[PDB]
Amino acid sequence: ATNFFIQPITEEAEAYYPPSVITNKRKDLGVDVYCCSDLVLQPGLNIVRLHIKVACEHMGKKCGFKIMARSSMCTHERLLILANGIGLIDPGYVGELMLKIINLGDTPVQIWAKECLVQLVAQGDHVPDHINILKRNQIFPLFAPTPRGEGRFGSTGEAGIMRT
Amino acid sequence: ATNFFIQPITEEAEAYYPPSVITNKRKDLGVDVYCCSDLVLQPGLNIVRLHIKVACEHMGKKCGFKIMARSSMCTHERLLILANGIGLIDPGYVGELMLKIINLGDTPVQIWAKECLVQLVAQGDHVPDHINILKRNQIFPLFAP
């Protein structure tokens, strides 16, 4: 069984993420996630919050996942790419999901709160069975402190904490 | 057993996809796919058709797959990237594969029909055993809506 757990962590996320269980009858690989706020992306790098904490679990164990562009993210009107190509979300991450979006155009670009620019894909590309939208308040076991915690964007250092 | 199935759906695709079964003796992860038409890529975003329907099957089940750039897609002469980083193809998708390619340069670039800019990779990165090039003029149930 492959399940995603999404918890809204702002008032804005609560508009798009009511407490519910979503099934994946279509068997799509990706879980679309909302901007939740109207965005203005400047030419160059933009750091964008997704207003959610996410956990993935496969065969009953907490696992990693990937952030991938939707094919609709990039249009003639909006030349947007994920800076990191895909987002590699480590099993131990329990912070807010963030995006690095490059606007390749010369003009600032507007995104609606209701748009999904990206999709979450389980470690190993397993088709999700259920998407669990958790209550904003609750404590969830899978968000418990880890060695990584909310460490992201070079939190591990230049050498990679991995090191060698 | 991981198998790919490619059906050409245009006469342009029939030039590059003769009916056959390709084995993957080298155990490469990626299945190279042809442009099938010469194209000029304008600076900015370009929509490129791949002229094929594809199915992947793993352990007897229809699965998804991914479209990745070949390391040779991007040269000094042609600063090309996949707009979406990786193409994510759902198990239920039975239409023509399409690419969104960005030309990051100031100047239009020529691609040739016989070039492969991208490669297909099974859901979960399983090494393909066979690539079945299907006859153009059939309705295969694997491609049913």
Add this chain to the structure above:
Amino acid sequence: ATNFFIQPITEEAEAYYPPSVITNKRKDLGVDVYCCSDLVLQPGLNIVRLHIKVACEHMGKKCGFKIMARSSMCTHERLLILANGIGLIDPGYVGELMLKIINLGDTPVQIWAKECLVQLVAQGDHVPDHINILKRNQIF
């Protein structure tokens, strides 16, 4: 069990890859690898050598793996992307790992030998148990 094997093939790599066994207690998906040389990345495409040969094994069999940017590779100061999005390394490949990096900015940019810009990820995204740093030119 999922293990990486890194074999330095230059003296520059030897200086950053002393023989050793790294356990992945954090259970991170990616193995960070050094640039091993100071480099200046020009606007447009830059070919960057990683000074290493790498093997990945899963359940005692040699497998492929992938090269991805670290989320920290791209910043306001260094607008850097992997040209191919992710590098796909076939299980059959035994040569040096190479990068194609695009500087999207108008200005050259400095990268440092002790910097890791990219990470390796096993075929199938398996969490690595061990990273084995081998001796220079030591076979798998």
